[PDB]
Amino acid sequence: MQLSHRPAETGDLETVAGFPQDRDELFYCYPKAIWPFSVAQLAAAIAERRGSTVAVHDGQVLGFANFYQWQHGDFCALGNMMVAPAARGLGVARYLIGVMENLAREQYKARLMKISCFNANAAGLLLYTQLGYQPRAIAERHDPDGRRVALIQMDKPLE
Ligand SMILES: C=CC1=C(C(=O)O)N2C(=O)[C@@H](NC(=O)/C(=N\OCC(=O)O)c3csc(N)n3)[C@H]2SC1
Ligand SMILES: C=CC1=C(C(=O)O)N2C(=O)[C@@H](NC(=O)/C(=N\OCC(=O)O)c3csc(N)n3)[C@H]2SC1
């Protein structure tokens, strides 16, 4: 993969909104969203968040992420990490996490990145572990069926 990045643009939204393939996937990247996902929901997230970024390969938007918390001199918390179905497992999420870590260090002078991952998302837990994140706490949350799920709160020092 040769990947590049840029700020998300309006033109990208229909593409990104296409990424979650089912209710679970949507929940694991955007738990406040309601299925079906839509550009309006995505745009509403972008408006209340920062650092909405896309990753591009061979002319295709393949990844998206942003921050849902940002505290200058302190930390940022990664949100909305989404990858195109055809590009899963090819390093897009790793690439984007690295871009977002740089953004957190550079723009927000953060010392820490926080990532919170739902317990069912084994691939996410394993990837963030590979990238140097450690688990710090587990919180109870509820899924759309009202079932209890565990949110694994991980973090990583940035420099
Ligand atoms: C005239 C040709 C058209 C073509 C064509 O077939 O040549 N289309 C497509 O392939 C359809 N694309 C979209 O719905 C689209 N994103 O696709 C989602 C994805 O990439 O997964 C979109 C619409 S508005 C916007 N900002 N993005 C239509 S658009 C009309
Ligand atoms: C993986 C993506 C995540 C995203 C994201 O990028 O969208 N998050 C947010 O915006 C954070 N909000 C929640 O924890 C949350 N809302 O209440 C917030 C609170 O209690 O403090 C929630 C989750 S399930 C439920 N019933 N509520 C995390 S959860 C991880």
Side-chain angles (χ1 to χ4, degrees), residues 1-31 33-158:
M1 306 293 274
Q2 151 103 128
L3 288 151
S4 60
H5 67 90
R6 57 174 173 71
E9 290 174 5
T10 62
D12 301 327
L13 299 197
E14 182 75 52
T15 297
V16 177
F19 289 174
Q21 291 304 296
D22 62 40
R23 280 162 179 87
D24 294 351
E25 287 191 7
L26 180 58
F27 183 72
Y28 300 149
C29 68
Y30 190 2
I34 298 168
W35 187 268
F37 201 39
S38 65
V39 299
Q41 287 191 79
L42 177 60
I46 291 176
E48 67 195 1
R49 295 183 184 212
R50 309 266 186 287
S52 286
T53 302
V54 289
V56 173
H57 170 75
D58 190 27
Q60 298 304 309
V61 171
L62 298 183
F64 176 88
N66 50 46
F67 299 131
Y68 68 87
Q69 292 171 345
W70 52 93
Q71 296 287 327
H72 192 93
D74 198 354
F75 70 92
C76 292
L78 184 81
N80 293 161
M81 174 90 237
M82 309 186 194
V83 178
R88 308 258 172 105
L90 303 187
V92 180
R94 165 185 295 268
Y95 172 77
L96 213 41
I97 294 167
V99 167
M100 301 299 286
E101 288 173 354
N102 290 329
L103 183 61
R105 282 191 280 271
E106 298 164 17
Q107 178 169 331
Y108 296 92
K109 308 295 194 287
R111 279 62 163 174
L112 191 80
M113 177 82 85
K114 296 183 183 191
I115 298 177
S116 287
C117 185
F118 287 97
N119 68 279
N121 185 11
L125 292 167
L126 291 170
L127 178 61
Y128 313 134
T129 300
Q130 272 189 292
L131 301 183
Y133 287 74
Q134 286 173 232
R136 297 295 176 191
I138 300 182
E140 181 195 78
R141 293 294 186 265
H142 295 78
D143 78 6
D145 300 300
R147 297 189 174 105
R148 296 165 72 241
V149 290
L151 181 70
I152 313 306
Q153 301 169 311
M154 307 180 73
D155 65 19
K156 182 187 167 169
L158 294 179

